[PDB]
Amino acid sequence: WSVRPSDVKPNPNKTMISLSIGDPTVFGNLPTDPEVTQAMKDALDSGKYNGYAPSIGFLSSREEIASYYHCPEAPLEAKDVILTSGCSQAIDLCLAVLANPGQNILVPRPGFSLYKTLAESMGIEVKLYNLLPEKSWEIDLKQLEYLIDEKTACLIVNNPSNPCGSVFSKRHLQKILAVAARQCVPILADEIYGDMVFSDCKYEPLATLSTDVPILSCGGLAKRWLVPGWRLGWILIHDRRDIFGNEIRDGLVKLSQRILGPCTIVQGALKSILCRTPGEFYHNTLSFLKSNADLCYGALAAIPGLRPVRPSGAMYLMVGIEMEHFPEFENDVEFTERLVAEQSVHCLPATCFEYPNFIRVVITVPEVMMLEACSRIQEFCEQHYHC
């Protein structure tokens, strides 16, 4: 017999407030629209969506996604859509089809930690490119271009960003594409937060700005429809000039037949989710995020020693910590641990996203909980701040 695997307590009299949980559902203040719920119930009542779909998804479901995201600058037919078990599987399929062991991918820093996790598990090297906190978390284009070599199979771009809450300008997206053009590298666009911008930027999908650069774009229901548990995502294949060709398409189909795709009830409900979910839902969501973002940025900005970077989208912001003014702490991990011990407020240390001396805060908590949290954080910082 030799069976082996393959290769700080919170302050007890202050009630815990977590600003670290990356799930918009958790406090019940962001339920999905009733129409979303109804579409699932309708799909269930039909009895049509209980049998096996093809691995890449029902044709009609793929057709509905294609026609929901198609535009002349980035056309999509059903054949350009693969439905997946959440965006995470979408990202995983794209990486597994583009990159072999030994090849590298370029990942943002700070960045959603899934990319590094999926890639390093599959033997894929990860090169980290910086985002600039003083330029609205824009990509350091000079470093990005430098980092690309002959082993680079793929470039990961996440816009709008978790953990940054940034929304890249049109110009900056164009400048990102140009780098990818010159170095002849495809892009995996993680656009799970697409259309979730609450600022006076507008959202452009990356593919709608590309002419020469082939893009695999990943999205899903998780965040915009506030049903992350439902496990439905998708890959939008945005080929240019036959660079992906039939081969990447076929490879995606093959790799998809492994797990067999997402829950068929969610695929059946997708038509009515996209067609009947009112504009008010998306608007009320974005209005709540923005005013929570104003309260948070505003409260944290007033605190000596913190440097919040205002978000324009998604469901977070990053806060810089001026460590010189907090001598007793060595990094963001110590800071956040002490904050829990003294104030029972959990913020996520950005060392989790490969970016020390920052923290991420979610802006999806009820506003009265955001208010209380920031207040507690002001007291903590006041009590530990040194000039």
* Positions that interact with ligand PLP (CB under 6 A): 86-88, 112, 158, 162, 190, 192, 220, 222-223, 228, 233, 260
**Other Cβ atoms within 10 Å of 385 Cβ, number:** 15
Interface with a copy of itself (CB under 8 A): 1-7, 22-23, 25-26, 28, 31-32, 37, 40-41, 44-45, 47, 49-53, 85-86, 88-89, 92, 96-100, 117-118, 121, 184, 186, 214, 226-232, 241, 243-245, 247-248, 250-251, 257-267
CB of 25 to a copy of itself, least distance (A): 3
- Minimum CB separation of residue 24 from ligand PLP in Å reads 9
Contacts of 170 (CB under 8 A, 6+ apart): 202, 204, 209
**Backbone phi and psi for residue 166, each to the nearest 5 degrees, phi listed first:** -85, 155
CB of 244 to a copy of itself, least distance (A): 6
Q: What distance in Å separates the CA atoms of residue 177 and residue 190, rounded to the nearest whole number? A: 15
Q: Which does 162 bind (CB under 5 to 8 A by kind): a copy of itself, ligand PLP, none?
A: ligand PLP
Per partner kind, with CB cut-offs from 5 to 8 A, the member of a copy of itself, ligand PLP, none near residue 44 is a copy of itself
Backbone CA torsion sign across 118, 263, 188, 149: positive
Q: Please tell me whether residue 127 adopts helix, strand or coil conformation.
A: strand
Q: Which does 59 bind (CB under 5 to 8 A by kind): a copy of itself, ligand PLP, none?
A: none
Cross-strand bridge partners of residue 367: none
DSSP string, 234-278: EEEEE--TTSSHHHHHHHHHHHHHHH--S-HHHHHHHHHHHHHS-
Least distance from C-beta 243 to ligand PLP, angstroms? 24
2 binds, among ligand PLP, a copy of itself, none (CB under 5 to 8 A by kind): a copy of itself
Q: Which option in ligand PLP, a copy of itself, none does residue 264 bind, with CB closer than 5 to 8 A by kind?
A: a copy of itself
Q: What's the min distance (Å) between Cβ of 273 and a copy of itself? A: 13
d(CA 126, CA 366): 36
